[PDB]
Amino acid sequence: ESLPVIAAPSMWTRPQIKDFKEKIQQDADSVITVGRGEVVTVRVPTHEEGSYLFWEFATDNYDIGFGVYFEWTDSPNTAVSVHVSKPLLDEIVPVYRRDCHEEVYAGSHQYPGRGVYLLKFDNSYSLWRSKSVYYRVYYTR
Structure with missing residues (x-):
């Protein structure tokens, strides 16, 4: 109901894509497969001890849809x-x-309150190709 204060996110790209995939791969849970025509949502709750969310991601051969929502839910x-x-x-x-198959995509956002971030990996426009998503999320103070 009440009106939130929502800061603009920071978004950037960086070229070290080969090293990024090498490092995150060291946890298989950090690689997800998004089926053709599918949308995958990663839910990331806010930490009480945190003030920001940071994310990075990449793909192998093709682009993918990506965006971020904030869900006002006490997780x-x-x-x-x-x-x-x-x-x-x-x-x-x-x-x-x-x-993000050519560069690592990244960003950050200041917590607007308690809630849950929705990272959308959207492959709904792809008729024939699945996507391999390499991704990392973490909070800062």
């Missing part, structure tokens, strides 16, 4: 969960196609 855990496809939603990063 029991701070545990990250992944989901394949009442609460208020705000748009932090609009879902656009990203050339």
Whole structure:
């Protein structure tokens, strides 16, 4: 109901894509496969001890849609969960196609309150190709 204060996110790209994939691959949970025509949502709750969310991601051969939403939900855990496809939603990063197969894409956002970030990996426009998403999320103080 009440009106939130929402800061603009920071977004950047960086060219060290080969090293990025090498490092995150060292955890297989950090590589997700987004089926043709599918949308995958990574839910990332806010930490009480945190003030910002940071994310980075890349793909192998093709672009993919990416955006970020904030869901005003008091989450029991701070545990990250992944989901394949009442609460208020705000748009932090609009879902656009990203050339994250050529560069690492990254960004950050100041917590607007307690809630849950929705990282959207959107492959709904792809008729024939699955995508391999290499991704990292963490909070800062």
